[PDB]
Amino acid sequence: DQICIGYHANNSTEKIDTILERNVTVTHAKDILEKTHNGKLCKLNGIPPLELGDCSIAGWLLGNPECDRLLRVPEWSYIMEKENPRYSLCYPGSFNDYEELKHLLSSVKHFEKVKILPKDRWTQHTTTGGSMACAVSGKPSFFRNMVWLTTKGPNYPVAQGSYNNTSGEQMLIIWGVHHPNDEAEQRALYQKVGTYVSASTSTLYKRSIPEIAARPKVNGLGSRMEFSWTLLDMWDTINFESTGNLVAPEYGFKISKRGSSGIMKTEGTLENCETKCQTPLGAINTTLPFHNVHPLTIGECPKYVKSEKLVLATGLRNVPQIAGFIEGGWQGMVDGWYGYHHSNDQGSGYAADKESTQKAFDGITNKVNSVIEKMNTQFEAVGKEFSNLEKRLENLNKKMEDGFLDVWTYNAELLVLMENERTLDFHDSNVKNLYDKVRMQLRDNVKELGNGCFEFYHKCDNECMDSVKNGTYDYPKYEEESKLNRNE
Amino acid sequence: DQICIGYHANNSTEKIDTILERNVTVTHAKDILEKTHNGKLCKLNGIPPLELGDCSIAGWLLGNPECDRLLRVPEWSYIMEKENPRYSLCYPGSFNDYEELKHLLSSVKHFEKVKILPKDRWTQHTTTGGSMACAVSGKPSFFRNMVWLTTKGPNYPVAQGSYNNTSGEQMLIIWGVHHPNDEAEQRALYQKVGTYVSASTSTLYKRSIPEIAARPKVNGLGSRMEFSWTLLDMWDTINFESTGNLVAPEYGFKISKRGSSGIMKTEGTLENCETKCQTPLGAINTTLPFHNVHPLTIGECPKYVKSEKLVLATGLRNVPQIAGFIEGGWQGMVDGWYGYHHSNDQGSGYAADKESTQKAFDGITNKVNSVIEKMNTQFEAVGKEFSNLEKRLENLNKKMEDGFLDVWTYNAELLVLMENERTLDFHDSNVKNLYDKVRMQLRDNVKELGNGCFEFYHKCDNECMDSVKNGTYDYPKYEEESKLNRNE
Amino acid sequence: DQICIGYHANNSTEKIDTILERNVTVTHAKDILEKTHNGKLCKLNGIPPLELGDCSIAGWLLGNPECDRLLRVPEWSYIMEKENPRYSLCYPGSFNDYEELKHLLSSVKHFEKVKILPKDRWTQHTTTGGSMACAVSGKPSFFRNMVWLTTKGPNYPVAQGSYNNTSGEQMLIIWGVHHPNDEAEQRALYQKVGTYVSASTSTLYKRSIPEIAARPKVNGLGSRMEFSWTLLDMWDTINFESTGNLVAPEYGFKISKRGSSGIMKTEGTLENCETKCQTPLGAINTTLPFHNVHPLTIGECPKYVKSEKLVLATGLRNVPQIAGFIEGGWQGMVDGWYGYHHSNDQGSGYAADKESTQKAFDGITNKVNSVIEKMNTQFEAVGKEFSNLEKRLENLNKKMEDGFLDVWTYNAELLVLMENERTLDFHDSNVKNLYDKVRMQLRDNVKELGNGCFEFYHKCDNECMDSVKNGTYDYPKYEEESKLNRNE
């Protein structure tokens, strides 16, 4: 008769890392890092994004002639833009607080264009101005959302216009100021010099004076156009007054839907799929708490770490080898993790200890859940733009993001490295504890063999082996025969 | 005769969380999170705060006629300001670099008001101007710390004034520029058009031009007043020159005491209590690392986390059931953690080991003290204000704060879980070591019963048990009759 | 004859820290913190730094008459500046976006000075202006890289000048505007009132108007000079136009070499040594992962923490005491860590177990390397400069730096403590495992003595002892002899 205690082994080739040892083969493992994407851009939560194409944000809002598709834009989930868009400000110039506007458009999901100042209301000016830079079919043209006021005959009266925000939400209004090349242009266009442009609301007041100078030619013109924007609150009035050089707005953008969005810089094209997490390289369909695809994610997504391998051990060490756990594992005990092997006269087979296996299984599952179900990630549509005179702010942002990434990478790496040690020691501690429990139950009626096995002095049938496995071993009832056989 | 090794059990209820199991009942536990406050705004370190009431900082520093109780204010610990104050600027307008001023006030604890430009020195202008927007008892009035200069007769000379800072500390000076509504109001107030206001110091030069335009009416007026501020250094001079539209100062604010203060946005009122850690919801009185009351605190305030429960286990696992440490804990052993139970003919009672319990106590205490005392933080204010043209900066600050708090939350949770697991394993290891030491010392004169209890072969008296409990047991002394009784 | 199991002890007095114990003596330990520097400023990677002296960045770039040794500056690795430079703008004034220029200079390692507008091209103006503040040898002078334009006779024609960037890289250009003290000197210098200065590129437009006002006298003069800078891209043109008050540039700075550099604020001089990291207090020649000299460094440098000591335990617990291991360590085992001691008829002596010692050594080395070789050492927390109106941004930078530095200090301390505890427990477990291995192999043939020492029941000679040492012990061979001696 003989009973042995050992652990389960199989043909797995999975490896882990530990703070003491490297490349340790295990029976089971769980990868908690995602490294695969579909390489495609598609709909987030069922709502397609806003594809700008070769246009820019300023070109879309101002109404570039070469962006006529984006004049009635439906709802969107995120905005796709190119790094160096071609269709941009048609007339050379600038755009004040451009980055602030782009940041505002990261929490806006829909716009509704209202006509606030109709073109025909300017009955004392000429409103059919154009330029060769912004040309369609050879003929000169201009922005579709702005009006260029010019003299009607040799006189340019004071231009006055107002609008009361009775739409139902905040409104985005853009106006421009013209900077000619020479005094001859100013006289030919506005008939007077020393002009001003004045825009004022209940919070904003602004005066601008045209500045005439010879400039390097961009797009073939030495003139420039400067654009500014404001955010009009509900039930508030905006006032325009100018003696010249005013590029008035004809449409106002009302914020219809708010939420979480962002601008994602790609060179790609929308395709047909759905997703819940989006990266500039592709979508992610995963449930693990880590990934290393791309830092700039849009939507609820797993955390980003700069790691190539994060594997958690959920099984025993694979040391293949009748002996017991001192020699190695068993490749025939496919019922659990810790078990026995009886060798009596009426049979020779393996088994599993249900209680210890269940306890260890619950512990490992709880550990995996605790490591996984402890990280809280919000929407976090990161990504901000800074101008060429804001380099310190850009460096600050970059340093903050990199610092947090390094902190989290170190945290995750060391956590996995320590917990793999803990589980690998937990398993052999459990095996030794089971061996000690069996030895304490058996007392001196058996004979330790040194390889993890026990040799019985009394002939033990299958029922007595079952009693030993359960825990109801009756030492006194086999005591006398054991003594007689041992003393002999 | 028997001797057993076991541990202590009681009727405790406190639960802890480990990394392998959840809701483990323990004998002793320590809470390292505080969630209670008195809901009252108190005096920090015995100095009452500054109750602005319905006034803004601009109203206090400019002399709003209805904020007349703040003309002379004593020392303060922090400033309490409502979220939307209602007496800020009776005359509509703007304050330049307002948030910078509010940040500067976070390091100032006392102001002394010094008359720098007396109102009677302007002997060539009119200094009694007023408006209905700032009205007292119905009659028109104006700010109490500023002077409005107006034509005396049908002429307006150049207004010149200077002050040399011979006070003893840095000075704060506020001036303003008036922007009228129409040309008639400019002519009826300053008699000339095309005026300027020039303010200059050794490190500052600034010239402003009045703006005349029709604007929407706020408080019944279409005109605006724009205010600016500067910090005058010691032994430095400030010059004022204006041909119109100047709202000159009369008082300057000198920084008397410097320190660490802050602005708290609350709607409450000050009560009679003393406090070292103040939050917008109440006061904290605790000696613990973490809390979960409010992020924006002021004072020597404990660390902040987003967790609801952080309990450290400083005791044994509570499992009740004469058996030993295998079958569970003991409810009769009251004077220690580990111990022995013995049963002679001359007595049957409990005991407790001293060296082992003392070592365990010292280790647990050192662990708790290390976790508590490594977290070193100081007193600083975390509130910052940003304007509506600075939203990227606001998002940067918000993201940095949130990220740091999530990092510390993760650190605290992992620390507590892993340390609880290690402590609960440490207790079992200590008990097993005690059992092993006793067994090694007793050698073969005894017989293991398998439930942690040892049964002697020879008769053992009280002195023998006292000898086996401390580490001096004479195996040769009882060897011979132990053999005689065993072999029988 | 007996065989015993014990561990190594020696005369080291090194101490390490543990999460459960303080000041624990260990046989071997490794220090991973560097606290020493050579107290010198010298060459970084073979390139000497730029010694400004009493110069300033603006004084060097403008051509201060006393800042005359840096008119032809070779390659540099970092810039050494003083906290309060004395040779600075000799004509009083300001410098717009100074901190942005200083930030840009942190990524440029070489400049080349190109004559873009020769001083002889101004044939219709006077170009020999000077001031007593900006003085050499008593007689008046001016900056050496700028031209002051003044009327030639009683006439100031329209100044005009352009440059096309055909150099090869980006160019930095600085110009200035003069702000006089009174109308008399404006007329005596520029012959007209109501002047302007226009500078324009393909991406920059600017118009400035002089400000005439009496000002406090700094450096003896009541007038000021305001300077501005731009970054001209390749194949781009800059246009200058002025009717007065223009300080035109004569040279432009080409960015010859780019890289990683910085500005270090010290008060010392350059000496003759060669380093790889540089701190304001000295230089570091180390390979350790950490240091605590100064937060601001330049070069490949270890991480900075607020720690007084960080020592990793790589040895056993020094417990000086043949007994074995229950009583203490051995001072005679000079070979390895764990070993045996035999005492038979032939002789006595110590030995060492090669397998256990090698396994433990490899594990400890792997742990040390994992702690050290997991910290991202790319660069450090650079030093940024902010103005007096950017206090909020400076506070943000300071708080982020402090938060990250605190987080890393806490992480390193807790890592060291927990690793030390686990190392000591690891050594204890290894010794116990060796003891249990020998006991299981030897079984009943021996009797245990209770202090780590086994006594045989037969004659175990040198062949026997070498057999037991390397795990090949024939229990059947001596079974009958052991039974004979045991039973009797």
Ligand SMILES: *[C@@H]1O[C@H](CO)[C@@H](O)[C@H](O)[C@H]1NC(C)=O
């Ligand atoms: C490992 O054994 C399993 C049997 O459970 C088998 O399905 C699998 O294919 C084997 N793996 C390899 C690589 O042969």
Ligand SMILES: *[C@@H]1O[C@H](CO)[C@@H](O)[C@H](O)[C@H]1NC(C)=O
């Ligand atoms: C572990 O395996 C990797 C291959 O994935 C190898 O580069 C590395 O050297 C191995 N380490 C050890 C200790 O065998």
Ligand SMILES: *[C@@H]1O[C@H](CO)[C@@H](O)[C@H](O)[C@H]1NC(C)=O
């Ligand atoms: C704008 O309209 C609202 C209601 O539609 C009205 O209360 C408000 O007075 C109007 N604004 C002005 C300046 O009249």
Ligand SMILES: *[C@@H]1O[C@H](CO)[C@@H](O)[C@H](O)[C@H]1NC(C)=O
């Ligand atoms: C632990 O106990 C708390 C009691 O507040 C309960 O809410 C929670 O669900 C319990 N968790 C488990 C895993 O039993």
Ligand SMILES: *[C@@H]1O[C@H](CO)[C@@H](O)[C@H](O)[C@H]1NC(C)=O
């Ligand atoms: C201001 O007063 C100080 C004396 O406290 C004097 O030294 C200084 O010259 C004065 N400033 C001016 C501009 O006269």
Ligand SMILES: *[C@@H]1O[C@H](CO)[C@@H](O)[C@H](O)[C@H]1NC(C)=O
């Ligand atoms: C604060 O707690 C201490 C206990 O340390 C107590 O003595 C004191 O009365 C408490 N004060 C208040 C205001 O609760």
Ligand SMILES: *[C@@H]1O[C@H](CO)[C@@H](O)[C@H](O)[C@H]1NC(C)=O
């Ligand atoms: C410790 O012992 C070593 C022998 O290897 C010796 O070289 C060293 O000087 C000793 N140190 C002290 C402090 O005794």
Ligand SMILES: *[C@@H]1O[C@H](CO)[C@@H](O)[C@H](O)[C@H]1NC(C)=O
């Ligand atoms: C450890 O040693 C240091 C210096 O020798 C001493 O200040 C400290 O009190 C000691 N701590 C303990 C627990 O002995």
Ligand SMILES: *[C@@H]1O[C@H](CO)[C@@H](O)[C@H](O)[C@H]1NC(C)=O
């Ligand atoms: C500047 O020079 C480049 C080539 O040297 C030329 O292509 C460009 O047209 C020039 N710029 C102007 C404004 O002529």
Ligand SMILES: *[C@@H]1O[C@H](CO)[C@@H](O)[C@H](O)[C@H]1NC(C)=O
């Ligand atoms: C610097 O450290 C190196 C170790 O790589 C050493 O060889 C060299 O002598 C050291 N130089 C000085 C000046 O300390």
Ligand SMILES: *[C@@H]1O[C@H](CO)[C@@H](O)[C@H](O)[C@H]1NC(C)=O
């Ligand atoms: C073990 O040592 C004995 C010496 O008694 C030697 O004969 C045998 O070859 C050794 N075996 C191994 C595996 O080193």
